[PDB]
């Protein structure tokens, strides 16, 4: 409603770095809000695509940002009559970023890893890795829970049970308010998908450089399965956290699995011990229900609500024809201990191949009426196919079925405007929360400031 679509702020990075693939707000130790931006195809030292992370200070004019430096050299350790190898070429550093307190977490979901023992090997595979930084202090640390030193032959004997070689940890990420980092790994357990949790503080105290394989005892990984419903389900494609069991001392996890049960797609809500509390199944196959998940209380009852994006849902139209437009589902948490029922609201895109619901960002309370609001991305929507971001406002009964404001892409065709979103933070300190939009196709990030209501 009250986002300013006239005077935008533009940040930008190198040509072809996919600057804007992922973004989040970052408050330093003094509370000064900055923007951290992931550019997963930034060139490294060897002039090879490695990805990179930028930390953008708030300036109404915008412009270029300084890099948040990480080590980009491949590592090798000859220990225990084995050889450990990390390969950072095309690792995609910055494919997801997230901030918590004065710490930044950026991940390289396609960092490869292999172990050599004489003639055998573990196989060179993308375990993924996340990098952690405290920009003010210069502290650095890594976390790579799916690295292993088990050889290829062993996995064959046990029928590839507990195979963490292709996790792609850091594909999606989130941090609980208590400081527990949660990594989605859609390739873990032979593309069933897994989650990895570990306190940030214990990631720093247990990391030393050059070790490559180290223990983090306070960590917790989800579990393999023999159920074919979970096969190739990419469990961990998207992740979020919320409060869904009534116990405020426990934090619950929300996980998207958009190819669950033979591309039906599903979203599950779990406790911190990965025990299943509810499961929302997809409405239509290959709709990618679960591509994106968002948690926020939209109807002002103190109970977090769930939003799920199916950017490929095909809407039924006249003459028995179908049109891929995308769809967003709203689930209102009921009073006390009860299951989340049918969707309270169905939001369906309009533009063909617009992928309405590819990204869903909690905005906070935008118009300051007492109900939290959201933004929904249609990165190839709008009449021109350039991309659109749609705002929907909260209300006592959920959300308004029609948008209050529509943000047309100020970038050229193919920018993927809206592919990444983040709101609910006041960056210019004017009392109203603001929105940042990513267009990695144009290598830029647009900042929309919220103004008093007209």
């Amino acid at each position: 409603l009250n986002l300013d679509p006239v005077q935008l702020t533009f940040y930008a990075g190198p040509n072809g770095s996919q600057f804007g693939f992922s973004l989040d707000f970052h408050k330093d130790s003094h509370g000064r809000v900055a923007i951290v931006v992931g550019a997963p195809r930034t060139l490294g030292p060897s002039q090879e695509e490695t990805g990179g992370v930028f930390l953008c200070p708030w300036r109404a004019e915008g412009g270029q940002c300084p890099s948040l430096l990480f080590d980009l050299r491949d590592e090798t350790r000859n220990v225990g009559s084995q050889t450990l190898q990390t390969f950072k070429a095309r690792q995609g550093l910055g494919a997801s970023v997230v901030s918590w307190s004065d710490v930044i977490v950026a991940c390289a979901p396609w960092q490869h890893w292999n172990v050599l023992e004489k003639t055998e090997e573990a196989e060179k595979t993308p375990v993924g890795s996340c990098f952690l930084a405290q920009p003010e202090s210069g502290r650095r640390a890594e976390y790579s829970p799916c690295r292993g030193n088990t050889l290829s032959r062993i996995y064959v004997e046990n029928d590839f049970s507990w195979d963490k070689r292709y996790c792609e940890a850091g594909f999606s990420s989130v941090v609980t308010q208590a400081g527990e980092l949660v990594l989605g790994a859609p390739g873990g357990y032979y593309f069933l998908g897994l989650l990895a949790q570990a306190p940030v503080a214990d990631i720093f105290s247990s990391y030393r450089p050059g070790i490559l394989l180290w223990h983090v005892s306070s960590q917790s990984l989800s579990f393999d399965s023999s159920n074919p419903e979970y096969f190739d389900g990419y469990w961990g494609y998207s992740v979020a956290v919320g409060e869904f069991d009534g116990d405020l001392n426990t934090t619950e996890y929300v996980v998207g699995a958009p190819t669950w049960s033979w591309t039906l797609g599903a979203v599950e809500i779990l406790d911190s011990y990965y025990q299943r509390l509810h499961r929302l199944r997809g409405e239509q196959m290959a709709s990618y229900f679960g591509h994106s998940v968002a948690v926020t209380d939209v109807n002002g009852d103190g109970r977090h609500d769930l939003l799920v994006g199916a950017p490929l849902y095909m809407e039924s139209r006249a003459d028995r024809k179908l049109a891929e437009v995308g769809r967003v589902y709203l689930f209102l948490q009921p009073r006390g201990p009860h299951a989340l029922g049918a969707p309270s609201l169905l939001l369906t895109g309009t533009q063909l191949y617009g992928r309405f619901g590819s990204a869903i960002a909690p905005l906070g309370d935008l118009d300051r009426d007492g109900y939290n609001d959201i933004a929904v991305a249609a990165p190839y929507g709008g009449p021109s196919g350039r991309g659109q971001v749609l705002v929907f406002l909260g209300q006592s009964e959920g959300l308004r079925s029609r948008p209050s404001q529509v943000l047309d892409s100020p970038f050229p065709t193919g920018s993927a405007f809206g592919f990444s979103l983040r709101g609910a933070v006041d960056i210019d300190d004017n009392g109203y929360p603001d929105l940042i939009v990513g267009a990695y196709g144009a290598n830029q990030v647009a900042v929309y400031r919220a103004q008093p209501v007209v």
Partner: antibody, heavy 119, light 108 residues
Framework: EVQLQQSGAELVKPGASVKLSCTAS????????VHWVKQRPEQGLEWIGR????????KYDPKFQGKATITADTSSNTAYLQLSSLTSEDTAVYYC????????????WGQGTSVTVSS | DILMTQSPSSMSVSLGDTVSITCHAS??????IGWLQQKPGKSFMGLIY???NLVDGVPSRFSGSGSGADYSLTISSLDSEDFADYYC?????????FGGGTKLEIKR
Amino acid sequence: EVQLQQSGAELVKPGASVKLSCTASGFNIKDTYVHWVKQRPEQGLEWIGRIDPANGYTKYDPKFQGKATITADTSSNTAYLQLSSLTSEDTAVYYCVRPLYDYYAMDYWGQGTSVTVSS
Amino acid sequence: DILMTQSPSSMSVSLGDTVSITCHASQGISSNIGWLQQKPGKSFMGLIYYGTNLVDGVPSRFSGSGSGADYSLTISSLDSEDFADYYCVQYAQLPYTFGGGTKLEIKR
């Protein structure tokens, strides 16, 4: 806290067998590797072998192949070291070891089990 | 197997002295070495791993250094508890192998 509580001192005859235990306290035995080390005053410290209690796979110094046998039961959270056809040279103190962070290190140690072989 | 030559076998020193134990390997091990402490009639406590990193809880007066096939353990300002046996251990290759041991004795 991490603590390795080993079995009590044993007093056996040559040719017989003994089975020392190493019970985990304040952590799951399944987490890391578990090594066994032999200590004598003259010969000093010698590495027996290791086990990964998550899967049971083991490695041994060729010198102990035959006498040492390392096992692990995650249920009782204990790791075991079996010795067979004992000899006066097997009279030593035996420690179980695990690493802190580094997968391959030797940082946490048990109190040690005292073994005496004599007729 | 890799032979770990630890020197000296023993040394007589006093409180507050700054002493250095060394450990020489038959080949390179690229800092894959640890340092241990066994107080008289007791068990072992981890001091260093990966050549330089301190085990949690150990004081900062201990410090490891070195590279290739020559490493060192240094204690700045000895304490009354530091008089004990010290061993090095390599884990670059299997089987792991230890050093002969070094005992710190009170001088008089």
